[PDB]
TrEMBL record, chains A, B:
Keywords: Aspartyl protease, Host endosome, Hydrolase, Protease. It comes from Human immunodeficiency virus type 1. The chain holds residues 1 to 99 of 132 of the full protein. This is Pol protein. It is found in: Host endosome, Host multivesicular body; Virion membrane. One of its GO terms (cellular component) is virion membrane. The keyword Hydrolase applies. Signal peptide: none annotated. It is a lipid-anchor. GO terms for molecular function: aspartic-type endopeptidase activity. It comes from the Viruses.
């Protein structure tokens, strides 16, 4: 679709067998999801935003469905206040900015 | 123009007579610029991000030129790690996410 920005650009995702809502976030290099149950290996990581830093777990080659579009990539899991789909996955679904 | 997301979507802005670079940020409701000198009056405001919160100064009705598109709106100024243009100004320049 084309999505305008008068509202938060929220979309439905499916990951780890679960349905969630997430914000399409061009301001985010990586994808960060709130605490959820994901299977498999992970790695400790620390990531920074506006107010400081958080600790997350890094899952690689995770299948995620974003507004119907499948992508496979790194997903970070941790105490983010909002589920964030970052450019690492946005490029995979062909998402662009336009004005 | 159309902007893809393989790299940070950075653009040139002009605000308060000064030239700066800023990230087009669909994940940001508001616009937040690093500490810079802006003319008139402002109001205290607290904003939350991934790792906590910061104090910013709220400037209303500020003229900003974003990649050659003029907009007038609220700009927050404070200790953000990156200049970020939020949806409040993105809607003004007609910016969309799409295909
Ligand atoms: C009240 O108004 C506002 C409230 C919160 C924000 S917010 O904290 O900045 N923010 C609000 C969201 C949290 C809902 C927008 C989000 O896109 C932010 C802007 C930002 C901030 C600092 C540095 C780079 C980019 N992206 C974000 O925090 O990124 C993290 C997580 C994802 O991967 C990384 O890539 C950049 C950064 O280093 C990492 C902005 C405005």
């Amino acid at each position: 679709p084309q999505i305008t920005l008068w509202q938060r650009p929220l979309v439905t995702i499916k990951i780890g067998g679960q349905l969630k809502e997430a914000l399409l976030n061009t301001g985010a290099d990586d994808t960060v999801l709130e605490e959820m149950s994901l299977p498999g290996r992970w790695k400790p990581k620390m990531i920074g935003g506006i107010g400081g830093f958080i600790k997350v777990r890094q899952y690689d080659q995770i299948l995620i469905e974003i507004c119907g579009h499948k992508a496979i990539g790194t997903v970070l899991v941790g105490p983010t206040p909002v589920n964030i789909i970052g450019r690492n996955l946005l490029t995979q679904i062909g998402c662009t900015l336009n004005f």
